[PDB]
Amino acid sequence: SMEGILDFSNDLDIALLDQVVSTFYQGEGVQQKQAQEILTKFQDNPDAWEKVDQILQFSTNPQSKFIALSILDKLITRKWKLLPNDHRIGIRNFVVGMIISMCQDDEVFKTQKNLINKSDLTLVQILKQEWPQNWPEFIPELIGSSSSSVNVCENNMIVLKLLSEEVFDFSAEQMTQAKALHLKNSMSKEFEQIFKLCFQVLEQGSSSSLIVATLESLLRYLHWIPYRYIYETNILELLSTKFMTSPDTRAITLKCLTEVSNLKIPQDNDLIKRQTVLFFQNTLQQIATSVMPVTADLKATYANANGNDQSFLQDLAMFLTTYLARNRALLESDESLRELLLNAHQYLIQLSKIEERELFKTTLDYWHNLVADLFYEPLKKHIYEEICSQLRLVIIENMVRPEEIQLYKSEREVLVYLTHLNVIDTEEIMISKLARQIDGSEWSWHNINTLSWAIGSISGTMSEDTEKRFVVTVIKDLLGLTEQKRGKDNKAVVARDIMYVVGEYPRFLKAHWNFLRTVILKLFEFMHETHEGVQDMACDTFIKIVQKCKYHFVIQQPRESEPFIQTIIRDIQKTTADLQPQQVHTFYKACGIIISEERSVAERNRLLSDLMQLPNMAWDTIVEQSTANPTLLLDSETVKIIANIIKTNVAVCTSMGADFYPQLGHIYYNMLQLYRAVSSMISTQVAAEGLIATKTPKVRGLRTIKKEILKLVETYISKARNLDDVVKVLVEPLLNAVLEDYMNNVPDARDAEVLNCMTTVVEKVGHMIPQGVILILQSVFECTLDMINKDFTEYPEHRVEFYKLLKVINEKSFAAFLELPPAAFKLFVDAICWAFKHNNRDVEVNGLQIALDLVKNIERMGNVPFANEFHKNYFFIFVSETFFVLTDSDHKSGFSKQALLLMKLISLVYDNKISVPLYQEAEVPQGTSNQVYLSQYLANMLSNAFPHLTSEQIASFLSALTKQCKDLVVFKGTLRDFLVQIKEVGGDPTDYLFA
Amino acid sequence: EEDEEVLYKVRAKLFRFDADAKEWKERGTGDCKFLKNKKTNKVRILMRRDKTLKICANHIIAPEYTLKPNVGSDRSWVYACTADIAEGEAEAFTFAIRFGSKENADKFKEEFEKAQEINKK
Amino acid sequence: VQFKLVLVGDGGTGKTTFVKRHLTGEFEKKYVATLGVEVHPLVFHTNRGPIKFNVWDTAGLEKFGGLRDGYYIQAQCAIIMFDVTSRVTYKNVPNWHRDLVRVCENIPIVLCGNKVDIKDRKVKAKSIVFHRKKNLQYYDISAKSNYNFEKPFLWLARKLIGDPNLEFVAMPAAAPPEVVMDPALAAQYEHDLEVAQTTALPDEDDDL
């Protein structure tokens, strides 16, 4: 039965529509869902708008009337201008009439705010179409009708709020530049009269709901109106006194005063400065007398979450921070405003203690502004000494782990400034907090962790002498805390915190070799501790200290027999014996950092030799037995050992880069033999077991070997300084071992990592291997394209790596594309346009960049057959493909680079930089310029694609695009204007003259 | 769970097999517990999701059940369960459970068989 | 004790994936765009008894928008979702908020930045400020890693019940029934188990 309403050959049964709507909003499961589908199809019926007037009159369901207005809104915003004037006036009148009628009934006005607000927004959609040009007395009649009734006056304030929002706040994306300027100027020209209604209601009104709606409209007006409406009327006084006393108006009033604080205001006017001070004084006086005193526990109030207390305290933080960030200098020099200044900051100290992460960040941004200013501005810090002392405790008690990168950074910067301002106060707070860990009063894992992070954060702020005393004191206290504590859990928490603190004071470690050596040896002891987290923190602290203090490991320290790097390498088997593979890799990586400090080549190469001794000997043993009998790779255990050898090589190559070459040279030949052997096993296994083989632990392990070998080579070549060796020694064996294997595996067995490795090769030495680049394209291009051109989802990594490779080949070795046979060059253009149509931002952006780079590469060839053939074959393909993704609404993320590409293509023809006619002979008179033909081609293409546009709209748009094709920002404005006009009927063609 | 002894506890990800969609669908991640009822000495699997603590497995470790390897994993078990009540009404499922390591999966199988022998008495 | 919750935000931000994970525990890797709205009851067990959300998971894509703001009518709470890997999805948050609060003037709303599991984050912490003036709760979330997975619902439950000390609790676990195998479905179980053993488990590279 419910599907009856979709039958438009009948008259609509409103009793039925009301059933469907009720079963959707109030019903359940199966029937809620099928009602949903019926309502959607009803609403989207392009004749459904004809039914709206009937539904609004005869429906008893305010939800049906809401959906009716949704249907009408689709008509108003998209097809309005096709209606005869009489019909548009008909609709305007039945919307206004319905609004007034709903407002004049008290019961309806109270209980149906949803339908009234929706009606008001529908009215504003009509105003955007009709006002003022076809409705000049709208604002006068609204102002007039406001005296008639308190409900109509209140609702008129909702209409004016929505109008201001639609014109000033949300016009940028929804209207042409011209239409936005027209509506902004129209509201501006009539605001004097709107303001007088607003002001009179605030001065004399007694309805709380009327006053609140008036202040809600004022909040929107404050985004755009001139300051004089606020500073040259009584309105500042009313907002900052009367409306702050009433809780009903307080929330919206605070939000208004925040926006008042952001008004553009004269800067050299003592009266205006006094008014700015006065409204702040009034506001804070009302808070202290009507809401809570400066001493109030806002942490407690906020936690209790009574009524609107949380939103109010959020709004107070926003108001104080906004006002003080702009105006605190007004309060700083006059001794009579000192109490106001410090009371405002005291409210902010109390707000900063609230347990609410996002509110804390708001206050922290302000504290950063303040303490940065106290650090640089003369004669200011002394004002804020008690505020800063309190803030030191708040920041230390709220310190987060450095893993929370933005919050830790903000907190550290604030605490560093505060420490500089008073190092004695900072130290005293941190040492007394440590004492409350030691006496058990504040002891917990979270609390010792928090304090450790705070202590670490201020490294570098103290003098070296003060830091030395401070660090020794902290380390002594944490060592005593560890001894005192019972159980492995407790001891491990404090031990992690000692190693965290030590890791953050490299200046101290570099001055105290004996202590640094002790710390490293204790970290080595910890690398045998199986207690969860200890081995990880030992390895993490090791590499962190090495990164900061590497030089102290590579020199011979006084009273040592050799550089400490030799001592580490000589005992590495024992040190690393109990570590997991990833921990071993970190350890080897840290050793590589130290070895790369040794700038004597002989000594560096010997340390590298000695570090790689264990993996090299395990490698040699495997190679000897893997060559003597190829079966032993079957052993899952051997595959894991090989993978971990290669990963150890990657880790050391990561830290040594160019210096790694001799180690890569030692393994290179057998590494590529292993790549080929593993490759055979994978191909064989997939044949014997099916595609499922690629999910088996065995094949995944074999593919790990291939991926890690590609990662090792990519890592080395990305950092290589000797590119002659890369080309003469590494490239040919690499391309031989990896390209044919990639091409000749089934899609599911191809490693995306091959494409990634080849991107680095072309990036670093592409200019030196033109024949190698051609071989790379021959091996990967067509087979990879065929994997990714059936849909946008399959082989996501291949898709991304494929376009990164094409991008670098197009940048470094364009000649490789010149060598493609025509059919493959066509596939290249196809692949670029395919990248355009991705939603995936990585692929989309590379697609558009390749297109721009290709056009530039063709431009450089000058007037030669290949360039002329390119333009004749592909210019219109690139123009039309680019327009398609610009206008289809499915590729908004790529707008900038789409606009850039289109501007490049249009400017080529505008300048006459294409030497041949782009048109086929007999298509136009044989003399005709490419400018004339391009204009005709685009007019025809846009007319076919957007048949609802007029010829004049398309001609005016294209005339603007042509003129603006050397001015990106304006060109983009014109494109955005076109994107607005294609979404509606009867767009004004003069919009494209906007200047 | 207050009337039960905790015999074994391991972090796991549980899947159920969708025959319709021919694919494994995750049911939960969190602590998988073998709970021995102090009254009946019957051992159940009880698994709760991280964060929400909602039940993703609640069934007797039936002596008739057999842990089989999954083609994809050296750290997972697949078994038929004829009566799981995680989501209310007893339902039959093909479960897969995956662990942090092969050692954890091997240890799970060991405890699961120990529980089966307890449930046989 | 049921509350209407409306989920809004750009297509592909992870609204349906987030809800589905909460409903069944599953992580849907495929993107199947919602058509208009999907309504699912979602129950949490609290120290103050059960709370039921009637989740109206709405379409983010304009071409699948259906009734659009028609879905928001009599919502008691809301989640606005964006994707921290897609800047445009954050740029659109004020548009979703606008359409939402015009229909729901005084409801608790959580802003959720989804997909924080992805290394290449595009919407930086420092950029995310829209919530402050609009009094929205904000959470970084991952429907994939379960990062802050329960936080949006815990926050809304506290606001709707008006108890800031409300906690999610463990639903106590009934003794499961003992079973006997049906010898008629022995052959059936052999087949289903063969099919399941030879279908690979997803994400074999994850930590679980």
Ligand SMILES: Nc1nc2c(ncn2[C@@H]2O[C@H](COP(=O)(O)OP(=O)(O)OP(=O)(O)O)[C@@H](O)[C@H]2O)c(=O)[nH]1
């Ligand atoms: N990496 C990652 N992917 C996610 C996450 N959440 C969702 N996804 C994926 O992102 C895509 C978005 O899925 P949906 O939930 O269907 O998107 P939606 O917001 O419901 O979109 P519409 O229904 O069109 O409005 C899917 O492929 C999900 O698997 C997340 O936290 N991390």
Ligand SMILES: CC(C)CCNC/C=C/[S@](=O)c1cc(C(F)(F)F)cc(C(F)(F)F)c1
């Ligand atoms: C990891 C825990 C379970 C047990 C650890 N208990 C002992 C560790 C203490 S604690 O880590 C500690 C002990 C010493 C000590 F050698 F001087 F004692 C020195 C340091 C160093 F090197 F950082 F200065 C640190």
Ligand SMILES: [Cl-]
């Ligand atoms: Cl200032």
Ligand SMILES: [Cl-]
């Ligand atoms: Cl503790």
Ligand SMILES: [Cl-]
């Ligand atoms: Cl140094």
Ligand SMILES: [Cl-]
């Ligand atoms: Cl030497």
Ligand SMILES: [Cl-]
């Ligand atoms: Cl755009």
Ligand SMILES: [Cl-]
């Ligand atoms: Cl249209």
Ligand SMILES: [Cl-]
């Ligand atoms: Cl069985």
Ligand SMILES: [Cl-]
């Ligand atoms: Cl549920």
Ligand SMILES: [Cl-]
């Ligand atoms: Cl906030």
Ligand SMILES: [Mg+2]
């Ligand atoms: Mg969805």
